[PDB]
Nucleic acid binder design. Structure first.
Ligand SMILES: [Cl-]
Ligand SMILES: [Mn+2]
Ligand SMILES: [Mn+2]
Lengths: 82, 98, 91, 103, 107, 95, 96, 77
DNA sequence: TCAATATCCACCTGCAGATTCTACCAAAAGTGTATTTGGAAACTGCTCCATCAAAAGGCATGTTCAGCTGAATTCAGCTGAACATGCCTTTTGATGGAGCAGTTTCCAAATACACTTTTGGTAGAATCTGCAGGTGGATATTGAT
DNA sequence: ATCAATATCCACCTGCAGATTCTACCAAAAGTGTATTTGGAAACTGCTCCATCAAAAGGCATGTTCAGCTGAATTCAGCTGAACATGCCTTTTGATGGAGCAGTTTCCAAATACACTTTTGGTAGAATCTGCAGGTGGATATTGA
């Protein structure tokens, strides 16, 4: 089935929850749409590179290292997947 | 009925979610979004159970971290409520997009 | 002894702006630039190869690395001009 | 010369030796040096072209660092690429926040 | 006579040979001295010993006998030096140090 | 038909027992620890690689490693770091 | 005739942004450079150029830090950069 | 570090496009600049020492700036 | 505006510090040949990943209400800018001496190879066991009177 | 100054999904016997890098005046937090089909390795030149009346 507008899937209660762990006590109402905008940019950039690595390896499957190497590029070095 | 004053449960939650480590976004919606974004780059891609988990670990991490800097930016403006400009300042200083 | 991309930058300078010349320091900035990118590009290419248990850096590594290293249109164009040069050199 | 063979100014020889003596990989393919050289050339082209303009715009016939910075920072893409680099003697793009202005 | 693992030779728990082999196949250099693998295995052993120690303590504080990430996070984020060493790194499942801005607390 | 993969798992565990005999570590945490050692490994060696180069050297000595360590590690982590290394190399050559 | 407060500043800003010369005194800096160096290693000698690097790097950084500083002051409605601003910027950049 | 006079700092804050400057800034800015230099130089030297030299060349600085993610153009690559 | 500062700002112009152009001498870069290999192409065993189906309760949504935060004003204390001064620490400019990056030129010690054994580790199975997930009073912590 | 009203702790329970161990093969360190180098070590340049030494001249430090920016204190419109009811969709669990990773073979096509010949690119003279740096003369941008 056709995937569309799934950025909306990142609900407001969730974003709050992520804001709570961040240490925010009060959240403006405009924040929710702004956060999505940023998350979708972060993701794009990280997935874009990931896939570039999947392509150079000539695979159809994005593997966890692909992501990790990708995160490493953007200096968002992840520990725990390889 | 008994009622908690505004902000009191906000503080309650902060302690709650900071003491825990589970992921705060629902798994399926995130997996969906990941495939949508990835699909618009290369068609017929497949993902390792873990590859998606990775992405979600990074994402949540990134955002939680942004919200901290975000919140220090609201505090600096004498405010107590984070706003977009609070989020943007933090990203300008960080250098994500000056 | 010692070497620099001064000669080549200057040649390139001429094609695009025959009338203009370039100072010492500015020349020096250009050298720094070439080397850097060179390193970035070569470094990543090294990395690609390695992830792929490869022992040889093909021009494919260079190209892919350039996709990862350069932004938007700078990237598109860079692949072209470099692929063009290989098509040509090879034949 | 290999470089004219690839119709390039940049030394395809020099780069090949640089890649061999660079520790990047166990062995370097023939197309590598060419490919990269051309990319180093093109990027050079691109920055000089803009500098030229800048220099031209300033009324000079000699490209200097300031011309390079103006060139670099004004274009978004080159700015992304040299985002964590500083041109010595470059200066900064003139920018004064609105609020600071006279009302 | 019987062979001495080079690691035992230097009195190290980490694998000095494994390290030497990774230094060569790594393409970091054309050649590798015999002391480098040793020296390095040692630095990696001690750093591993360093974060393991603080982690265990944190597992202790929480009445658990098995170290999990959270403990590693807690370890890494509280020591000033490890926290700087792993400043741009994120521990999957590690959470964040509990910290509430003073202004946000009740009157 | 098997595909053998390696990690410093076994070694980390050996060190885990020395500091805390009664403590144990989970898979995930063992994973974290594995990433750690590699990260560091590549950082140290990569810096080593640079040093040798900036100095027209074709061999990475245990000496380069050490300067690498000084440049990469902060404060006492580095002080103590170097102590273990040196000790390890001295003891190795002698026996 | 007296120029109202702050008018000059804008003229100082327009001016200095327009140039690219260093703005810290050569000798005092070099003196600063050697001093710090000597606390690390002694009887060191600097290449003339080395000090230019160090000064070029320092100034560039400092000017940049002020742009982020300013933005932090404006964000608080103030128009005068203060130490909290400088600290906020550094804290966000990840320097401390 | 006191050699870094207040009127020069103001200039720096001016290029940064700052209109008004609190009085404490100056001691503050001096602090930060001191840390910058200390960090950049310690690495430079380490590099100088590894080379078994008594002179900190312009390249050592260059290399140490790279390591601090403050890359510099104009003295080497 | 009308005026009276003080400011920029093009227009013009004259040489010395750089630039760019020459003129030659080594170090690479290119050839010619002969080899070593890396890894693409051809199966094919088989994990792992894409998909669906169900039952179920965890939670995202949307609505009321109203507490209290953000924002708009207003005010005046005094901090930091504009200045005109007085004075000295930076400029810079040779001038010289000498610590010292840099080059050689051997060579003894440390490495790289190329094989041949000899263990140490990894990938399954066999055994354990923290601890996740529930339960329940004790203990505050809150918010209304 | 009290007290319900609630949420948060902390300890005891107990099977089970996640370690801990237990065992067998084998890919890889270890052990030797050569075949190169690698990069110190004396010797010595030619540098650049310190050091005085010596004047001038911006450029820094100061002490005045005050203009207007920061700071604090109210007020109130209304935004966003807390709550409840609703009912949708994410979770959990397992079942299957099979696309496409990976592990082996096989071997040309391609990269590596010398040994040599040619040409190019880096240096240090020789030969132009662009801006630097002042110097007028004239709208500009400010500020007061
Ligand atoms: Cl302050
Ligand atoms: Mn789509
Ligand atoms: Mn001029």
């Amino acid at each position: 089935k056709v995937l569309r507008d799934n950025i909306q899937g990142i609900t407001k209660p969730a974003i709050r929850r992520l804001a709570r762990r961040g240490g925010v006590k009060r959240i403006s109402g405009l924040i929710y749409e702004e956060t999505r905008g940023v998350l979708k940019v972060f993701l794009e950039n990280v997935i874009r590179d990931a896939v570039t690595y999947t392509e150079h390896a000539k695979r159809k499957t994005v593997t966890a290292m692909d992501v990790v190497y990708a995160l490493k590029r953007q200096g968002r070095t992840l520990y725990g997947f390889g | 009925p008994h009622r908690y004053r505004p902000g009191t449960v906000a503080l309650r939650e902060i302690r709650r979610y900071q003491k825990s480590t589970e992921l705060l976004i629902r798994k399926l919606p995130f997996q969906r979004l990941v495939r949508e974004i990835a699909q618009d780059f290369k068609t017929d891609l497949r993902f390792q159970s873990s590859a998606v988990m990775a992405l979600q670990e990074a994402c949540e991490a990134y955002l939680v971290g942004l919200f901290e800097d975000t919140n220090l930016c609201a505090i600096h403006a004498k405010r107590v409520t984070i706003m977009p400009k609070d989020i943007q300042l933090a990203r300008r200083i960080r250098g994500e997009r000056a | 002894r010692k070497e620099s991309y001064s000669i080549y930058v200057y040649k390139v300078l001429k094609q695009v702006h025959p009338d203009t010349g370039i100072s010492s320091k500015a020349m020096g900035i250009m050298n720094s630039f070439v080397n850097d990118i060179f390193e970035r590009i070569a470094g990543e290419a090294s990395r690609l190869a390695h992830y792929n248990k490869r022992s040889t850096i093909t021009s494919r590594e260079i190209q892919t690395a350039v996709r990862l290293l350069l932004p938007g249109e700078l990237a598109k164009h860079a692949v072209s001009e470099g692929t063009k040069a290989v098509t040509k050199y090879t034949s | 010369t290999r470089s004219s063979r690839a119709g390039l100014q940049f030394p395809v020889g020099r780069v090949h030796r640089l890649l061999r003596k660079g520790n990047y990989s166990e062995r370097v393919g023939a197309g590598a040096p060419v490919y990269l050289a051309a990319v180093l050339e093109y990027l050079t082209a691109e920055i000089l072209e803009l500098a030229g303009n800048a220099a031209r715009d300033n009324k000079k016939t000699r490209i200097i660092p300031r011309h390079l910075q103006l060139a670099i920072r004004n274009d978004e893409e080159l700015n992304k690429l040299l985002g964590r680099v500083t041109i010595a003697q470059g200066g900064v793009l003139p920018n004064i926040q609105a609020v600071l202005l006279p009302k």
